[PDB]
Structures are given as structure tokens and as C-alpha cells.
Amino acid sequence: VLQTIRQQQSALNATWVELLQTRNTLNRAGIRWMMDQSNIGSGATVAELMQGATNTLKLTEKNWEQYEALPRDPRQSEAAFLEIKRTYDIYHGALAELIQLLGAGKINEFFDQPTQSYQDAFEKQYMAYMQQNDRLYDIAV
């Protein structure tokens, strides 16, 4: 019934949320890394933050596969799902590369990566996909 899109919706939202939480944690580690260069570091360490980003990026993978493996209503759009996955893989892959750049100390290459564009592209599909499902709500009446 209409419960199969609400459960598929919740699964993709949890991926969306974990991607954002991962990007934020990485940028915290960037500040601490910067602080350590000038020996003014305090609070959370780079290692603890990198450790947390690694965890939430794996959580992101697992949340994604949980959404992929959920059944799709025949009315939904196949192209829509492929565009979601295309933008997700770029965004997820970009965060994985940010972990490597920071570990190698490439702070400029880290900061200059156009992560915002990858995120904007995924959010554009998520929003459009949220709208098409909200319409299946309005017509399932």
C-alpha cells in the first residue's frame, strides 16, 4: 500500500541525514588539523573526528543499501531512481576521498574539493523524488 513509499522514503532520508553528518564531522576535523599546525588545538582530536566520520560514512553505505533493497511501486520512475543513485555515488565517493586527503594532510585539496556541488546535485534529485512520492499520496485516496 502507501506504506511501501513511506518506508522507502524514510530509508533514503536516513542516508541523506548521515551524508550531511559525515560532511560536517570531516570539516570539524579540518579545523582541528588546522589548529594543530599552529599548536592551538583543543577539544576533539583529528583522529577521533576521522574515526567518527569513517563510522558515519559506513552507516551511510548501509542505509543506502537498505533503501536500494526495498521494493519499488510500479508507478514510480526508474530514471528517477537511477538519477538518485548516480548523484549519491558521486557524493558518497567525494566524502570517501576527503578522508584520504585529510589523512595525507592535503588541506587545500581537501578544502577546494567541490563537495557542495555534489551535495546540491543529490539534494535536487531527493527533493524531486520526494515530490513524486508526495503525489502518489495525494492520489492513493
Place this chain on the structure above:
Amino acid sequence: VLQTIRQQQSALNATWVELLQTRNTLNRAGIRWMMDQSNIGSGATVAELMQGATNTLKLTEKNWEQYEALPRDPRQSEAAFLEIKRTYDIYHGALAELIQLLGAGKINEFFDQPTQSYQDAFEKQYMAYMQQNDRLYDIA
């Protein structure tokens, strides 16, 4: 009645998302701020990021008022809403404080603010609130 729920969940989830983006942009600005002090600045500038964070923090405040104005079903717990609002106000106000600290060059107070705890507290209520509406959706 079921439509009333999906509207609330979407309005509150939009606030949740905007809070996360606001915090991330502020942490991007913190890096560039430190880059400027070390003369290795590149990418997005502090000013552009600060005006982005200022922008998204207003989207958060608006997205919240949209959720708060939507009608609450009687079956929904009033105390649950008060706890969502309490944790939201702490979290929002904390992000507003980060804008003041970074604009004042206070990078240590900026980094040391326990923002994670404010976010964890709001996410705890947000998760509990959704699981309740989901069980409510199941009954109907």
C-alpha cells in the same frame, strides 16, 4: 488525519536538514578562517560561507515556524512537542552563537562549543517523535 502527519514530519525534517547544513557551512568557514591566518587561503571565502550560514539559519527558523503552526493531532503528545522545541531552541541558538564567535575571531570558543551535544539532544527527540507518528500511521 494521515495527511496531517506526513505534513508535520516533512516540515520538521526540513528543519533538521537545514540545521545540519548550517552547522557544516560554519565549520567550512572555520577552516578558511584558519587558512587566512596562515596565508594559505583558497576555495570558498569566509564571507561567502558566513553569508551562506546566515542564510540557511533563517531557512531553519522559517522551516520551524511552518512545522509549529501546522495543526497537532490530539493523539500526539503535547510533552513530546515541548521537548522537540526545547532541544531545537538550544541547537538553533547555539548555531547563532557560532556566527558571533567566528565573526569575532574566537576560534577556540567556536571549536569548543559542545554543538554535538545540542544536536544529539535534538536528534534524540526527532527520532522518538518520528517513530511515534510511524506507529500512529500504522494504526490507521
